[PDB]
Design a protein around this ligand. Sequence first.
Ligand SMILES: Nc1ncnc2c1ncn2[C@@H]1O[C@H](COP(=O)(O)OP(=O)(O)O)[C@@H](O)[C@H]1O
Ligand SMILES: Nc1ncnc2c1ncn2[C@@H]1O[C@H](COP(=O)(O)OP(=O)(O)O)[C@@H](O)[C@H]1O
Ligand SMILES: [Mg+2]
Ligand SMILES: [Mg+2]
Lengths: 191, 228, 364, 364
Amino acid sequence: AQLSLPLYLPDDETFASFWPGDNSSLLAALQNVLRQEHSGYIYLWAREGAGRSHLLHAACAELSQRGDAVGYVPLDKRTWFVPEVLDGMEHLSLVCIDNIECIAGDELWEMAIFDLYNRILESGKTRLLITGDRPPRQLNLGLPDLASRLDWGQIYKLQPLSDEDKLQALQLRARLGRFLLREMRTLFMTL
Amino acid sequence: PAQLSLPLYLPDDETFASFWPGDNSSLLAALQNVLRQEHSGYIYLWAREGAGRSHLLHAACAELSQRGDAVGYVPLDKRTWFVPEVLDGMEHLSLVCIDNIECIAGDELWEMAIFDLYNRILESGKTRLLITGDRPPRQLNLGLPDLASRLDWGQIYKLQPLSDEDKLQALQLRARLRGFELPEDVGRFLLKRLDREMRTLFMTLDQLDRASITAQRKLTIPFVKEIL
Amino acid sequence: SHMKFTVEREHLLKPLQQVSGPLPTLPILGNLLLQVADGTLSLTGTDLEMEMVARVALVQPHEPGATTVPARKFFDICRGLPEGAEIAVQLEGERMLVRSGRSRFSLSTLPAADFPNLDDWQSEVEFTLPQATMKRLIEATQFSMAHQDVRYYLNGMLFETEGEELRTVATDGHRLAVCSMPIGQSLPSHSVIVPRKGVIELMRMLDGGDNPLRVQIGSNNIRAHVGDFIFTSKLVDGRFPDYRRVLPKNPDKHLEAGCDLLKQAFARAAILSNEKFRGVRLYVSENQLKITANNPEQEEAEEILDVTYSGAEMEIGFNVSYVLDVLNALKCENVRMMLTDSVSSVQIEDAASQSAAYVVMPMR
Amino acid sequence: SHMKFTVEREHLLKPLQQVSGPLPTLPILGNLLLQVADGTLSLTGTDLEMEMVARVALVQPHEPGATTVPARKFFDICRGLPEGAEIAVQLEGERMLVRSGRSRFSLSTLPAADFPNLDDWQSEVEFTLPQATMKRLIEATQFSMAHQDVRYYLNGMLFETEGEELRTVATDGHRLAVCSMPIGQSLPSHSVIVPRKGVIELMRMLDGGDNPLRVQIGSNNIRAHVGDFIFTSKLVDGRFPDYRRVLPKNPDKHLEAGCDLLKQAFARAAILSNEKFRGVRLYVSENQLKITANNPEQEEAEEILDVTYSGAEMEIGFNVSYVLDVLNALKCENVRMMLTDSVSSVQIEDAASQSAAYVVMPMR
Ligand SMILES: Nc1ncnc2c1ncn2[C@@H]1O[C@H](COP(=O)(O)OP(=O)(O)O)[C@@H](O)[C@H]1O
Ligand SMILES: Nc1ncnc2c1ncn2[C@@H]1O[C@H](COP(=O)(O)OP(=O)(O)O)[C@@H](O)[C@H]1O
Ligand SMILES: [Mg+2]
Ligand SMILES: [Mg+2]
């Protein structure tokens, strides 16, 4: 009350379509916090096209397939929604904050993220996954309280696929090439 | 500084080297990962009896003390010998070890201090926090619910006690590290007569080694009885 | 039951004073456990950590019983009574009545069954030494204990028996003190940590005499018998650091000086030192020591005194309070300082006897 | 800035100690005004309310000048120096240099022209009395002064000369004390109010002797000469109440008792009195006094003692601290209590001499 309209994401970024190497230690901890009922906070960071958003969508679909409530907040598309959309997300099983470096210098959004952190911290059972371009200590944030909180957790560096793993990653989606090869965002889009 | 400090060397027999891994392979990996530089995290280690919760806190302290980092270990079971005001300033330390946090259940004077210390190292950075206990943070009946959700906020691990197989070669591991030699017939004799009490086993080694040093004879099965 | 006893005032004052001392923190912890058992009177006082029992011989008619009574109030009453007065004590209801002549006192009481009784343990090492020896072992090391530290094992004094000598060690992470005195019997090797307040109470119970001190060190408790007083204290369940690993191994600089002239020189230099950090710097040279100090008020004080020294020249800083504590514990003629370099510990001891040694860490 | 003098250590200790006492609150007020005038040395210390000057004879070469120097530091230096040492003092820049042997001290100074000098007033009444008489006049009344009261005239002691006797009075609105001692000369009738701290400093400057005390009471200041010390203090500009109007006019009840037995009875009854209000009740009857007290813990204490009393029976309450203060000031054999009724003042005095009287107001 009320039920929800069945919308399926028009993509294919599930865990099954994601290649382990060389992020074997990251995926091990990522699938550990996704297991009920305890939660935590993991920060992922990489340069470009490494799959930081792929893992968030995979973690969203991992809990969506078992009936858990999830929320994905693309902070790079924050020009289409308002910071008040994070209110109430402390009652969700998983919250994904994609591209948190885009709010560097945005006090209106830094305060919303900062308040949302303390809300799921005062409560329990709320998995928090945040991705970025640089480690949380390299994030130029006007709020120093938020910077120490983003550094308060387990931080992993995402390793982009080599040109070898990149090939068999493309064929993995065809089941669910060397001529097309090296921008992975357009490679999987080309299929 | 100023000033310097006394080179007081305590029983350094409890390090990561003298600690047997199994079956805490996943725990020891994340433990040595927050001891990286620089990494600030919070790990909770709960177990039952003699699983080495204080061993891993002493191991993490000696790991950072050997490279010049300031450390702090707060045994909450011996809290009758100090005051909650001893936590003040520990937010500037590289590592803070809170041992046996279940002893302050109902101690609102100490729960507030632990609660304030968490927020102080949370507002700041570069402060590793390691807390041990009897039961998971949710199974810990704390007076202040704000603290329970904060001890819940982090990575929680269940320490696994050594099997009777690994228990033997953990006693032999302390022999080679200390200098003496514990043969396999004497080790499997102490596990029977002392009834597999790891707290007293490694404590009995000093009694059996020292009496063997002042002879100076080798460890044989009837020699242990003569020492007794 | 019905407790009742009558005893002279002169038989209670000293036992009361010994069991009623500076000890907040719990209603019954401020009371004394009175109990009459034919034909003695036992006065007990504790603080959940240590207890103190005194036995008083009753030669006048009495009736067995037990109760508790506010210590300081009951002591001030017996102390305020005239000299030679008899004290009649009996229970009437939930309060105790004290009578001496035309003086009548009624004191609110608490049930004796609610009194914390220390579980009697198994004694191990037991020996008898004079009170002067125990007082020397305490006084020579007491000041180096730590107060309310996270290092709970440092908040006390280490009693260690080894063969023929009894040795006490105390350190606070900045300076160490170790004394050693011989006894007349062979003792098994054993070491325990007596708490701070235990050390305080253990020394104040020592009087002139002429009675020896029976000490019963156990697995987790310590008990000291002297006269008719039985002091018992729990032990600090911790591992005390090795003091032999602290003593400066192979120093190359030795300095002898008059203990008094050195003590007075540091005392004068401490006047113009920093009020908070107490920083002074020692400059050893050819048969000369130069002690200087200065404060944020830019006031400088210089003290040069002739010493017997031949080692290499060195400038080393110190906390003048730590150095003065060592020179005050060394009630002797000349002192000996054994140094290595400016950033390492320095051993101070008496130039005559070597029964007590001291280690102080310098400043930068 | 050219002062220089040299004097033995034994010539400075006692003068320094007299000018370095309980006196926070202003930079130069914590300094001593040193000033060399051939051939004496003057050491002054003040607090804008009173001053203390000491003169030291200089027999060694010196140069005129003046400066200020931290009192406690300068005192601790001269006190820390060995016995018999000479102290060479000279000015080098904005700081003072103290040298004694191989010891050199540099103390930051403040300009001597900024030192508060008391404006020399016109003396009026002047007399000379022994130190024992002044000490008796103060000790018998000091404890009855008030501390920082809106009745500013009560925060001190009333010095009153009348013909042949010098009388001191002190009261705090609850109890009054008045002592009177005769001198050898006739004095004009005059009365002034010496402040609390002035009374304290006036008595601590009294020693064994054998020197008399020259006192110069002025219009608004008082000056006391003893030895080479000249103490000067401002007076409390107020009207002190009439103590003769306070003394119980025509009492009808007189009680004599042993001073010690009465003091010890009140002391034992004070044990079980209220910790804050200190309430005890006296019940006088036929040749008997019954002192009882109780506390919120419902603990009662009863003290009955035989006295010489024939008046009507009365029950009157008292602050046991006020009564004990009077019995402590009356270092005598027997005391005399003169009462009227339960809600009126009671006069206590020595049964032997009537040179000092005390009045205490009862409780409800
Ligand atoms: N390990 C991987 N295995 C398979 N595909 C991957 C992997 N990493 C990245 N990709 C591909 O790249 C895309 C990841 O999205 P991307 O824009 O790279 O996110 P981010 O910009 O946060 O790294 C997905 O479409 C996915 O197909
Ligand atoms: N994995 C291990 N390897 C070596 N020694 C161990 C191990 N686990 C426990 N011990 C030993 O067992 C003893 C008992 O530890 P204990 O203090 O009882 O742990 P806890 O604080 O969890 O109760 C310790 O002295 C430790 O040296
Ligand atoms: Mg993306
Ligand atoms: Mg333990």
